[PDB]
Point group: D2
Chain length 115, copies 4
């Protein structure tokens, strides 16, 4: 599992469940190409987005649909989404865990990168 | 001043100085159009990006060039940039302050919306 | 002004107003002694806690009464307070700004130390 | 496992390993009594601090020794430690995960509370 996403809700103190996540990879023409997508589980985790074979070097964007998450809870949030943009596997394959901590007017994101 | 940006460095405990900031507005063809840009001051602030007249309702993206900032300090960063995407809504008088707290592998962003 | 506190609310997207802040200094018997206190203003700021003469080197604790803040807004919080413990060191001229970003189940704190 | 701690390093993008963690419980005389302690694993996790039987209602403080962590990495940090103070099991037993995200001049803490 080379790319995992974990999302937490800072209002409720719980995993952020059923959150849509879209992953894009930058193409040679500098456009964002759809790469993978999914929804967070009951534990706020999203596994199996990609494979070691498919997850080649490149610039990737992980877009977390935080607006739909807050709207489903009756809260009008500030952000359209939480966007994490990074170069992956530049010095060989790595395993990436993207954490996102959500609040209506704020978000934090952290990456844990392991060899 | 309807839109201000303030950036802090969590490694040095200081304002993040000379950070490039680009503001885009979503156009009718769903592309991002350059709207305003600048560099943070010695206080980590960026003022005078736009005016009340120009800053109409719409979807905006504030891109903070965090990678160039960390590379200029000799620190290996994770993100290409910190991206804040939001809708500007006219619900009475408003001023937006986008705060960003930077670390090499993490960032947090909050919006302060006041009357 | 050698010590300032700024508090933001990540649920409402605003300064955290009328938040009680208590500053303590560690005494020789290892107990915490009251040093200064106040409440954040309409801008979420607390100025004039101490003076250059009084604010000597030592170990300080800044306790932010986050529980009373959330309870006054009808929101169920996790923390009793946000606690910032640090050593003040004379390494040339210095001003400390303690920033705190609040959510019901989370907080972040950063120090901005400038010359 | 009613109380778990997970610590991440925002500079290195990795779990914060071998970090000392001390847990205290507030006694009837309003003093902090030692309750449990340990060190984070290679995954930045600390399990087995307590048991369902021992972890009764009360006010608890989780003190994370962030200063020793940064000093072992040759970085002079701002904070003495990261302090998380909360009322536990007030409405019956809960499982608590305390996340801490560390930077030299900043920390964030979040709680995930499950029934
Ligand atoms: Cl409208
Ligand atoms: Cl000294």
């Amino acid at each position: 599992c080379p790319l995992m996403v974990k999302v937490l809700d800072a209002v409720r103190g719980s995993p952020a469940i059923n959150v849509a996540v879209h992953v894009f990879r930058k193409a040679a023409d500098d456009t964002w190409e759809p790469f993978a997508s999914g929804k967070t589980s009951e534990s706020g985790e999203l596994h199996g987005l990609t494979t070691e074979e498919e997850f080649v070097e490149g610039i990737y964007k992980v877009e977390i649909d935080t607006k739909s998450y807050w709207k489903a809870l009756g809260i009008s949030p500030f952000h359209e989404h939480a966007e994490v943009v990074f170069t992956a596997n530049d010095s060989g394959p790595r395993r990436y865990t993207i954490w996102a901590l959500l609040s209506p007017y704020s978000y934090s994101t952290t990456a844990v990168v392991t060899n």
